[PDB]
Amino acid sequence: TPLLQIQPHFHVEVIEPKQVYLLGEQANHALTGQLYCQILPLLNGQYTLEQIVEKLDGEVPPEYIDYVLERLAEKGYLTEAAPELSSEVAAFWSELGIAPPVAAEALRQPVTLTPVGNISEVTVAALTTALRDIGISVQTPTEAGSPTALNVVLTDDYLQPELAKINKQALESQQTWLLVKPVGSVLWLGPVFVPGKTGCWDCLAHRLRGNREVEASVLRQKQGCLPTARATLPSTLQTGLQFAATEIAKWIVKYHVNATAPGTVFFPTLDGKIITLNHSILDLKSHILIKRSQCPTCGDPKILQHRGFEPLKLESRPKQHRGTTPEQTVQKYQHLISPVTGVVTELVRITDPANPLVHTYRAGHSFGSATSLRGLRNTLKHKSSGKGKTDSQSKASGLCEAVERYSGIFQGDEPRKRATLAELGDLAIHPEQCLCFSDGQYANRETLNEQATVAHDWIPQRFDASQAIEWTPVWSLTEQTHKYLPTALCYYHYPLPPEHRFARGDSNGNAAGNTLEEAILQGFMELVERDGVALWWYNRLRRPAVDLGSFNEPYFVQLQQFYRENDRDLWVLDLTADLGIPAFAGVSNRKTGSSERLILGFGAHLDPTIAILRAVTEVNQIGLELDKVPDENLKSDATDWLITEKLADHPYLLPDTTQPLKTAQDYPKRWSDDIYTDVMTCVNIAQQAGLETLVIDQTRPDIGLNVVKVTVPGMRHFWSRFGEGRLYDVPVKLGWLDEPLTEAQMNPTPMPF
């Protein structure tokens, strides 16, 4: 005696001879058959099988009717009707592929509501009413109460400290719960936390804290969370609670059908997802919550500790440079773009799409621990950015730099061991071998830092080797074993005591890639790039230009012309030094205008074509969008340099016509089609120069994208670090100088970019 019906979300239209159409809001179907036209109008929910068989006792016999229904049933068109559901509600559930009697049973599962922060009790009551109107009953939670299918938590902020406790009980109790924030101008809805499957609240909190740098800095200065949920219409509140009611219903129904019969339900729910609905503007975003494997609460926070002291698995990575397309790279890591759950704020093209020669993106910056308004605006600046010969490359470049910068930040779970320089002995690398500050610089550091125009020329205090410190294991690719550097050098924002601040982690050698060996290669090339620049810049060497019409690359020539058409000249200098890996400086000045806006960009690669490409796309990245800004409204570091400095002030910027133009053949080919072979080529080139190459894997498992910092002690940063070594020695070895310069003769102008 159950009632049969074609699922009620379909409007049935019989087109009499042989057709009947099933019209739905989100899908349409056509049945073909004499018998369908005949039987379908009796499958509206008013009939049992018994009734249809007699209703059709005229023509169609029972066994035919049976065969028709079996077919409809097996193809998913037929279902049992649920008397206790309205046609409209049944239709909602049948449209999601749920049999209405199954939905009716699932809806009988009780739910609990729990306020946190300043959520009113009438707000809790309103949601209760909303749920009741769709058939869901509510109960009040208690500390040791029996389990329910879902606990719904209403908050005014997702970083309310009480959520930590709720999250802890839920993980121990294996309680599934939902978060919602129906107050404020932006509705937050979700996620549904499923202990063991989805990320926990702590997984989310770790992203939230980071993406709220203003809030975080205020909190640091103040010395948790603060509000910001003031703006509420009663229509926005109700919009949020009714919306929440629907997603609650969809979750419990989904959950019911998967208790038995796992994986038979498809439709999306809020598990591992946050929805933001901005009410003031209109916009709806979905934010993916990644379950962090190293989560201190729901995961194993000792992964990176363990992995650091494990050797490095390097292997063949065939180039098809880089191992994959930038579009694949973007797709795989798009989900990391989110100011709520992500690691990059935004990813936007800034340049004119009509221009096929210039491709720059800005990827929104992350965070630093800033204790001042000074600190904020500085750690609010320095957006990550992308550059490319094409749009897709610049897009990938911007995304991957943003993840690169994040992955380098000290979280507190990085591989570490407390020891003195002595206990480790020779496996240890003294920080001064990397920094290369002069004795004079250290002695006068306080005055020099006070008089320094540029922030990144900060001279740290000296390293007291008597102090026990945290060393991080790094993999030596030359000796194939573990060495040790101070943790303060290996990661960003490692906290040191005020009396022993002997280093600030820098970005030099840091790189990301689709594979470890890809990231290492890029990191290495960055090091030779900076070393090359340092030699040229601080010795103020006169370098030959590059004939860009000899590389068989039409792009260099086209870009020069584009510069000519936009009030600029563009040329390239050779910075290739003792390693023989091509390295270049792109340089460009404005013709006309109030100021010359001297801009430059660098690149190094085994392939000189790519090296020049890197350099020249970096000048694009830094300068072209800055040109349209007037001198008054110019912001950013280097503003003084841009408005004040002239070509006549720095003759080492233009090529010396004394030397011939560098041609494509002046650069021997030393790259393969294997990325791994290419890095082992680089490790040996460095070793030939008496240089060791280390690697620290900064890859975070919740990120996926490989990030490393490559360190080659002795190689120079293009910052004002004038300790003895390559900076003085390389130029004479190459015959660029007859005699070394003294420290006092080094370029007094810090390299601006």
Binding site: A30, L31, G33, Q34, L35, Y36, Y64, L72, K75
Partner: peptide, 14 residues
Amino acid sequence: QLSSQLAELSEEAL
């Protein structure tokens, strides 16, 4: 061999 009206039966998503 199946009867015509039984055999002609078909369903499809449009």
